[PDB]
Amino acid sequence: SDDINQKVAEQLAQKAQSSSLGYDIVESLTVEVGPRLAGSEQDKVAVDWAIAKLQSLGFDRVYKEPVTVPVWRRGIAKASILSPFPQPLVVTALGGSIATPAQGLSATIVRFDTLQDLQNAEAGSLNDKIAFIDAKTERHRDGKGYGQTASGRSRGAVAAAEKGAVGIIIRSIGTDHDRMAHTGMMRYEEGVTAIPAAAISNPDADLINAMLKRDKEVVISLELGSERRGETTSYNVIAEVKGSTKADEIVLIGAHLDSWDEGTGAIDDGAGVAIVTAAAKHILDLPQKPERTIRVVLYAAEELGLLGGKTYAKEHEAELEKHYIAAESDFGAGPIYQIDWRVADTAHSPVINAMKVAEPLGVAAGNNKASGGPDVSMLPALGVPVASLRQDGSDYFDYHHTPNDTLDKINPEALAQNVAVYAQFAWVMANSKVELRPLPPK
Amino acid sequence: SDDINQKVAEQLAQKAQSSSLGYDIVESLTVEVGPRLAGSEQDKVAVDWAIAKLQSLGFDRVYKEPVTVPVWRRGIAKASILSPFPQPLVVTALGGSIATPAQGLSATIVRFDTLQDLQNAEAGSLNDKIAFIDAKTERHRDGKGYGQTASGRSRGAVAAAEKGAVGIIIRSIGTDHDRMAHTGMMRYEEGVTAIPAAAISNPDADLINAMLKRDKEVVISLELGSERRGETTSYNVIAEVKGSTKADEIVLIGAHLDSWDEGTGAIDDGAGVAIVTAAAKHILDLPQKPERTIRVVLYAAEELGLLGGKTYAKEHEAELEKHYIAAESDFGAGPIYQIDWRVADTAHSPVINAMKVAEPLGVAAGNNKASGGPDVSMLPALGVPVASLRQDGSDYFDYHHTPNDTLDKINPEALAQNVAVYAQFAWVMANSKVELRPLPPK
Ligand SMILES: [Zn+2]
Ligand SMILES: [Zn+2]
Ligand SMILES: [Zn+2]
Ligand SMILES: [Zn+2]
Numbered sequence: 001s002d003d004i005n006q007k008v009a010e011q012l013a014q015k016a017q018s019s020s021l022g023y024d025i026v027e028s029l030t031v032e033v034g035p036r037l038a039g040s041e042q043d044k045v046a047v048d049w050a051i052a053k054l055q056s057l058g059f060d061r062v063y064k065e066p067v068t069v070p071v072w073r074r075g076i077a078k079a080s081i082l083s084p085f086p087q088p089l090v091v092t093a094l095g096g097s098i099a100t101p102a103q104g105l106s107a108t109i110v111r112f113d114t115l116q117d118l119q120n121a122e123a124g125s126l127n128d129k130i131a132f133i134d135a136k137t138e139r140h141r142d143g144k145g146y147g148q149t150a151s152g153r154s155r156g157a158v159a160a161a162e163k164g165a166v167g168i169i170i171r172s173i174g175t176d177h178d179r180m181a182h183t184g185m186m187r188y189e190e191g192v193t194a195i196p197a198a199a200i201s202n203p204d205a206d207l208i209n210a211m212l213k214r215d216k217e218v219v220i221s222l223e224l225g226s227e228r229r230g231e232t233t234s235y236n237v238i239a240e241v242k243g244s245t246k247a248d249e250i251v252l253i254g255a256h257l258d259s260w261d262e263g264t265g266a267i268d269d270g271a272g273v274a275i276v277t278a279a280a281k282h283i284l285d286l287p288q289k290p291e292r293t294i295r296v297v298l299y300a301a302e303e304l305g306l307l308g309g310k311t312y313a314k315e316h317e318a319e320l321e322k323h324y325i326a327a328e329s330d331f332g333a334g335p336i337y338q339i340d341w342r343v344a345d346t347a348h349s350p351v352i353n354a355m356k357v358a359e360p361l362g363v364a365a366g367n368n369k370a371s372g373g374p375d376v377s378m379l380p381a382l383g384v385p386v387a388s389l390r391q392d393g394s395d396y397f398d399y400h401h402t403p404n405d406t407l408d409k410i411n412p413e414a415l416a417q418n419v420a421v422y423a424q425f426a427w428v429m430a431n432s433k434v435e436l437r438p439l440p441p442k
Numbered sequence: 443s444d445d446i447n448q449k450v451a452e453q454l455a456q457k458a459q460s461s462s463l464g465y466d467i468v469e470s471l472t473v474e475v476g477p478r479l480a481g482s483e484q485d486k487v488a489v490d491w492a493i494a495k496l497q498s499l500g501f502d503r504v505y506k507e508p509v510t511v512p513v514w515r516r517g518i519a520k521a522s523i524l525s526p527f528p529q530p531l532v533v534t535a536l537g538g539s540i541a542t543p544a545q546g547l548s549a550t551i552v553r554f555d556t557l558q559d560l561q562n563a564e565a566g567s568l569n570d571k572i573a574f575i576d577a578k579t580e581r582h583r584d585g586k587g588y589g590q591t592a593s594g595r596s597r598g599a600v601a602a603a604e605k606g607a608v609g610i611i612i613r614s615i616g617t618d619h620d621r622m623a624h625t626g627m628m629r630y631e632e633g634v635t636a637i638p639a640a641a642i643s644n645p646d647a648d649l650i651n652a653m654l655k656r657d658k659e660v661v662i663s664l665e666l667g668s669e670r671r672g673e674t675t676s677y678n679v680i681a682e683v684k685g686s687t688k689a690d691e692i693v694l695i696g697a698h699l700d701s702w703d704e705g706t707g708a709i710d711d712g713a714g715v716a717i718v719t720a721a722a723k724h725i726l727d728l729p730q731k732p733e734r735t736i737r738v739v740l741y742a743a744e745e746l747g748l749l750g751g752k753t754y755a756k757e758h759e760a761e762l763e764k765h766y767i768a769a770e771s772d773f774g775a776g777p778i779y780q781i782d783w784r785v786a787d788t789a790h791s792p793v794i795n796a797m798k799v800a801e802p803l804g805v806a807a808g809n810n811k812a813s814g815g816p817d818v819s820m821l822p823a824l825g826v827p828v829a830s831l832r833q834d835g836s837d838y839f840d841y842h843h844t845p846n847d848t849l850d851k852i853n854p855e856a857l858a859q860n861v862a863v864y865a866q867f868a869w870v871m872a873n874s875k876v877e878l879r880p881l882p883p884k
Contacts, residue, residue, distance in 0.1 A: 031652040034529035087476035088704070090845055178620060179705070179845040203848040207706070210473040262530070263621070264649070403532055403621040406645040 005431045009357045009424040015282045016420035023412045025274035030264040030407045037261040038301035039071035043234050046257050050237040050298050057281050060242035064235035067300040067311045071232055072096050074261060075225020084216040089204045092181035093224045094153060094197040105167055106221045111212055115152040118159045130167040131160035134205055139175040143393045149173050157197035158189045167196045167222055171205035179203055180402040183260050185304060196224050234300040236308045241284050243293035251430045252295045252326040253422055254375055256302030263405030271410055272329035273298055279422035290430035292324055299375040309375030320382050325429050327387045328373025333410040334392035335417040340366035342386045343436045350434040358421050385436040447873045451799045451866040457724045458862035465854045467716035472706040472849045479703040480743035481513035485676050488699050492679040492740050499723050502684035506677035509742040509753045513674055514538050516703060517667020526658040531646045534623035535666045536595060536639040547609055548663045553654055557594040560601045572609040573602035576647055581617040585835045591615050599639035600631045609638045609664055613647035621645055622844040625702050627746060638666050676742040678750045683726050685735035693872045694737045694768040695864055696817055698744030705847030713852055714771035715740055721864035732872035734766055741817040751817030762824050767871050769829045770815025775852040776834035777859040782808035784828045785878045792876040800863050827878040
């Protein structure tokens with residue numbers, strides 16, 4: 001009954017709070033693998049680590065599924081201001097950037113408040129120059145500031161090249177004022193000349209601004225080494241807690257296994273790997289079996305455009321109708337404060353009620369318009385219900401995509417609360433009688 | 443009278459709180475010069491900046507005095523763990539390190555809790571190996587943690603070479619857990635083979651520890667580029683507020699103009715330059731003249747061993763008897779909470795009383811055993827009284843000697859409180875009738 005399962009969920013939360021497992025999994029990943037950019041030598045290391053780890057935890061099935069991934073290698077990154085006042089910058093290439101010319105790159109910059117301002121510039125206005133997008137990212141619990149500025153990183157190099165720019169630097173898409181350059185994916189556009197593209201630290205962007213405010217033009221030097229290889233194979237890594245009376249139905253709880261390459265991928269998304277794996281292990285430890293199968297999916301190549309998520313959706317196309325609900329942890333280790341849903345209108349109040357078991361952990365009732373996390377975000381359009389278990393990310397963009405994304409950034413008590421809430425979610429959902437389909441129109 | 447001068451001191455503090463001058467001076471230095479390692483091209487840039495700045499503020503005399511300085515240039519710094527689990531490290535050369543061999547340097551490490559533990563190792567025990575000193579620096583308002591661990595940086599390369607080491611890495615002498623490597627001076631010893639010497643970030647030292655805790659040996663790669671040139675000339679930069687009835691007597695308020703090269707030297711010691719310069723300017727702005735001359739000294743090459751301070755003490759030897767008191771701001775921008783003295787026994791209670799004017803700014807009475815700041819610390823032995831105006835440095839070693847020592851680390855309200863307290867100090871001391879000599883035995 002709902003009552004019996006509420007009490008199991010209460011006990012799962014107790015276990016999460018008394019067990020070092022969640023922390024131990026992320027310590028293991030960050031120490032024994034470290035950064036694991038898709039397509040790098042560390043990609044296979046992370047996959048092999050995850051397979052061994054899941055086997056060692058005793059899951060009923062542990063297997064992997066191939067995902068095609070591109071190969072990009074980061075080389076040197078050096079930048080400085082040449083004039084008016086010569087100074088060093090702390091820079092990093094945007095993910096996928098081409099290298100700077102062998103002859104080298106030195107140019108006058110032109111500052112834009114935002115990507116939109118750059119897109120509005122006159123054609124030819126950046127000939128021989130480097131674009132500088134200065135947009136600052138606001139700090140928000142829900143990360144909505146990142147949502148407003150991230151496109152500068154994703155699309156700035158295209159917009160700048162369209163105006164004649166020979167390069168782009170951006171203010172890091174970060175909420176810190178640390179001397180850390182934030183990387184992340186960017187995309188060139190077929191038809192537009194690819195140009196070198198880098199992020200500079202927030203203090204460096206402040207410095208450039210201080211010089212511009214003196215009615216001086218700023219000239220920089222930028223050097224980026226990088227290399228592109230042909231595509232290869234990574235893997236979605238999967239573990240299951242075997243179901244019982246409804247074993248053909250799947251509750252999917254996910255994270256991504258890949259990361260950027262300059263930190264150790266601790267909060268993005270080693271924390272999420274640990275949260276969903278530990279939650280599933282606590283469930284595996286129960287004397288009771290869930291009705292549904294619980295499937296942990298550790299997705300490949302999320303950083304490169306949800307490639308593993310998209311691959312999974314297609315590979316499991318015939319199985320999606322039997323996916324009861326899907327959710328993903330990929331907003332660091334901050335505690336969960338709300339669960340939002342994407343279920344049938346007639347399921348919404350029932351699932352809110354089911355998850356009131358998490359109220360004492362600080363988790364509020366939510367809406368019925370959830371997108372789901374990145375790797376499951378394509379699944380509602382295919383009919384699959386999802387939940388967004390909302391994490392407090394107020395500090396997340398201080399470290400996201402920097403060399404500072406390290407184990408010591410994880411608050412163990414907060415990590416444990418996520419393990420507790422996912423364990424409750426996966427248990428309650430794997431035993432729920434609520435009909436979650438059909439999803440109402442978006 | 444003491445009463446009239448108490449009220450001027452109160453008004454000076456008002457000015458400091460209502461004026462952006464202190465902040466503006468450090469903004470100017472960090473933007474228009476940036477990092478200014480002694481002996482680098484930026485050394486002359488900083489001197490020329492300071493001369494122009496002091497002239498622009500209208501000081502009665504502005505001049506400079508030569509200081510011999512060594513020339514060391516930092517090149518590349520790359521390090522990684524090769525085994526058991528290959529990963530990147532964030533490293534920086536210790537100031538003055540020789541370069542690593544052209545053939546390259548890869549070696550097994552041996553961990554030591556502290557410099558003392560390394561010094562206790564058996565001769566030959568580090569043959570072919572790299573020493574790793576792991577001592578963590580405790581956070582303290584007075585910086586006493588730095589005092590306990592700093593010698594690992596200063597003297598570790600010598601102690602490691604004595605035991606056969608081919609190199610040394612240290613846990614950065616820092617209180618942060620940021621991915622920032624802290625540099626700073628080290629000294630080789632004539633007679634002992636010079637070896638490459640670097641600091642790694644605190645998270646990287648944690649990582650190495652996590653591998654060692656797995657009963658694995660750790661092997662690293664270390665690459666350091668550096669170059670030593672012959673000595674050259676830097677300068678102590680001096681400004682004066684002209685005295686009146688006691689113009690032959692000097693109240694010296696100082697800071698150092700030089701910095702390490704990877705940040706912008708904002709808190710070490712751009713803040714101190716701004717504090718003492720702004721304090722003197724507020725005094726210069728008064729309609730009243732001080733009795734004594736107030737001398738702002740912006741010392742050269744403090745980071746390389748107090749070279750400008752030592753030079754000043756010798757150059758001004760015949761003038762020291764007329765130095766009434768000396769003090770230096772070189773503990774960032776945190777507010778002052780206490781003034782300690784080094785005056786005659788019979789002057790102690792009188793100077794405490796004189797400075798009770800700063801109580802409302804949060805400044806407590808202090809002792810009579812002050813060392814004085816670094817550049818004036820040699821002066822008591824020459825008979826010159828000093829004060830230590832104690833700053834709250836709880837956060838100072840998060841940024842000291844890192845690339846993160848940037849303008850945005852300065853709390854403007856705290857910087858203003860220092861300007862207020864130095865203005866009071868310099869005014870009260872430049873008009874005091876207390877006999878400060880002779881100093882009692884140390
Ligand atoms: Zn992520
Ligand atoms: Zn990411
Ligand atoms: Zn200093
Ligand atoms: Zn220093």
